[PDB]
Amino acid sequence: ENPVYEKKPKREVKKKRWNRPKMSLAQKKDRVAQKKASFLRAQERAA
RNA sequence: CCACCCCUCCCACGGCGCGACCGCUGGGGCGGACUGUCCAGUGCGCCCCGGGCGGGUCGCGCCGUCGGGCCCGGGGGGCCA
């Protein structure tokens, strides 16, 4: 009788990011700086 | 028409210090993610700037030059005029 497809109307999206963004070079380069500081004050406090 | 004496036009090229324009670019603040075996650190989206730098566009001031304009225009020597 009526095979034609009435589409579902695209509601206004508030646009929030459920996905985690890609970690930038500055952050990645700085983490390994913080880690190699954290390791050397885990010796200076220790020894 | 040119050598002589001031001034004046646009165009060309080079220099120079200035305006008005896309990038680049430390710090002040919203907003959110994120990191570190101390509370401390790092991008990020709207904007704000304290700045400088050239790229070229665009528009100036002034200087350069046996400059180009039938050597623009106005106050003795050579022209297949």
* Token couple for A11: 């509601």
Q: Which residue matches tokens 């109307």? A: A9
Query: B36 C1' – A30 CA distance, angstroms?
Result: 9
Among A19, A44, A22, A23, which residue's Cα sits nearest to residue A32?
A23
From CA A35, how far away is CA A25, in angstroms rounded? 16
Query: B73 C1' – A21 CA distance, angstroms?
Result: 72
Which DSSP string do the residues of A1-47 spell out, in sequence order? ------PPP-PPP-----SPPPPPHHHHHHHHHHHHHHTTHHHHTT-
Query: B77 C1' – A19 CA distance, angstroms?
Result: 93
Torsion angle in degrees (nearest 10) through CA of A20, A23, A27, A31: 80
Among A44, A43, A25, which residue's Cα sits nearest to residue A33?
A25
Q: Which nucleotides of chain B are near protein (any atom < 7 Å from a CB)?
A: 33-38, 41-44
Task: For residue A40, say whether its CB is under 7 Å from any atom of strand B.
Answer: no
